[PDB]
Design an enzyme around this catalytic site. Structure first.
Site, PDB file in Angstrom:
ATOM      1  N   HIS A  69       0.302  17.731 -26.188  1.00 41.15           N
ATOM      2  CA  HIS A  69      -0.876  16.816 -25.798  1.00 41.15           C
ATOM      3  C   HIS A  69      -0.427  15.551 -25.804  1.00 41.15           C
ATOM      4  CE1 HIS A  69      -2.762  17.272 -29.961  1.00 41.15           C
ATOM      5  NE2 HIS A  69      -2.984  15.970 -29.527  1.00 41.15           N
ATOM      6  N   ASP A  93       0.857  24.216 -27.195  1.00 42.89           N
ATOM      7  CA  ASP A  93       0.592  22.740 -27.372  1.00 42.89           C
ATOM      8  C   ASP A  93       1.927  22.338 -27.986  1.00 42.89           C
ATOM      9  OD1 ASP A  93      -0.541  20.471 -27.209  1.00 42.89           O
ATOM     10  OD2 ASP A  93      -1.865  20.524 -28.905  1.00 42.89           O
ATOM     11  N   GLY A 149      -4.008  10.547 -34.287  1.00 39.80           N
ATOM     12  CA  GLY A 149      -2.843   9.874 -34.339  1.00 39.80           C
ATOM     13  C   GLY A 149      -1.767  10.516 -35.383  1.00 39.80           C
ATOM     14  N   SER A 151      -1.566  14.290 -35.092  1.00 41.98           N
ATOM     15  CA  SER A 151      -0.955  15.483 -34.504  1.00 41.98           C
ATOM     16  C   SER A 151       0.801  15.409 -34.339  1.00 41.98           C
ATOM     17  CB  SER A 151      -1.461  15.826 -32.968  1.00 41.98           C
ATOM     18  OG  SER A 151      -1.122  14.759 -32.088  1.00 41.98           O
TER      19      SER A 151
END
Ligand SMILES: CC[C@@H]1[C@@H]2CN(C(=O)[C@H](C(C)(C)C)NC(=O)O[C@@H]3C[C@H]3CCCCC(F)(F)c3nc4ccc(OC)cc4nc3O2)[C@@H]1C(=O)N[C@]1(C(=O)NS(=O)(=O)C2(C)CC2)C[C@H]1C(F)F
Ligand SMILES: [Zn+2]
Length: 191
Positions: A69, A93, A149, A151
């Site tokens: 993502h 992901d 911010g 991830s």
């Protein structure tokens, strides 16, 4: 689309964790377009950016991992030009590139501990109690802004081994009470 660009790192080498910036915004934009990044890379956790987003990437077993993502299918900038992803799994992901020369890799955790530590882009080290295969609770909940911010950053065990990659937050009225992560075993099978 441009490449993902390493713009800094979380320094975990001493007794104090702190964020370091290694490239400013204009150089980031230029490097994203060319894919050519001559900067020296160090450490386990990189701060990375695209034209539109910033997040983290973590080296485990010689692969720099991050979230789909954030990165999509993008190449990463490197001293020799754009480097194509080695792993892409939208269902998890998850994406990965070969770890840059100079990086250091975390080792996957084998100890089975449920006392974890989430490392954020601000170099906060946040205690997290593991609550399932892919979830853990913050010992001290905080506004979700503090996790935005981050991830792609790691959850670590007490011995500093990689337990997972931060993916999503469980939020109620803007307060993050828990985190959801990609377990390291999912990476290990991908490899
Ligand atoms: C786009 C943001 C993703 C979305 C929603 N999401 C959340 O956390 C949401 C919020 C919004 C309600 C908090 N919670 C939430 O679903 O909880 C549910 C229990 C979880 C179970 C579902 C998991 C879903 C997922 F994660 F697998 C996921 N798979 C995807 C796969 C492909 C894809 O293709 C485009 C997009 C995907 N999008 C996904 O999720 C993620 C997020 O914000 N991640 C963090 C972050 O920092 N991102 S970032 O660095 O700022 C950024 C944006 C610059 C990169 C850590 C968060 C920090 F903010 F805390
Ligand atoms: Zn461990």
């Amino acid at each position: 689309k441009g490449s993902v660009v390493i713009v800094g790192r979380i320094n975990l080498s001493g007794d104090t964790a702190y964020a370091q910036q290694t490239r400013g915004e204009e150089g980031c934009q230029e490097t994203s377009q060319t894919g050519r990044d001559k900067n020296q890379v160090e450490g386990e956790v990189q701060i990375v950016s695209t034209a539109t987003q910033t997040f983290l990437a973590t080296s485990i077993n010689g692969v720099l991992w991050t979230v789909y993502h954030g990165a999509g299918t993008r190449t990463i900038a490197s001293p020799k030009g754009p480097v194509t992803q080695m792993y892409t799994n939208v269902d998890k992901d998850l994406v990965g590139w070969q770890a840059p020369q100079g990086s250091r890799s975390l080792t996957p955790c084998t100890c089975g501990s449920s006392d974890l530590y989430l490392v954020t882009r601000h170099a906060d080290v946040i205690p997290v109690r593991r609550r399932g295969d892919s979830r853990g609770s913050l010992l001290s909940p905080r506004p979700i802004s503090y996790l935005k911010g981050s991830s792609g950053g790691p959850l670590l065990c007490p011995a500093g081994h990689a337990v997972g990659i931060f993916r999503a937050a469980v939020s109620t009225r803007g307060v993050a009470k828990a985190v959801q992560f990609i377990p390291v075993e999912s990476l290990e099978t991908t490899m």
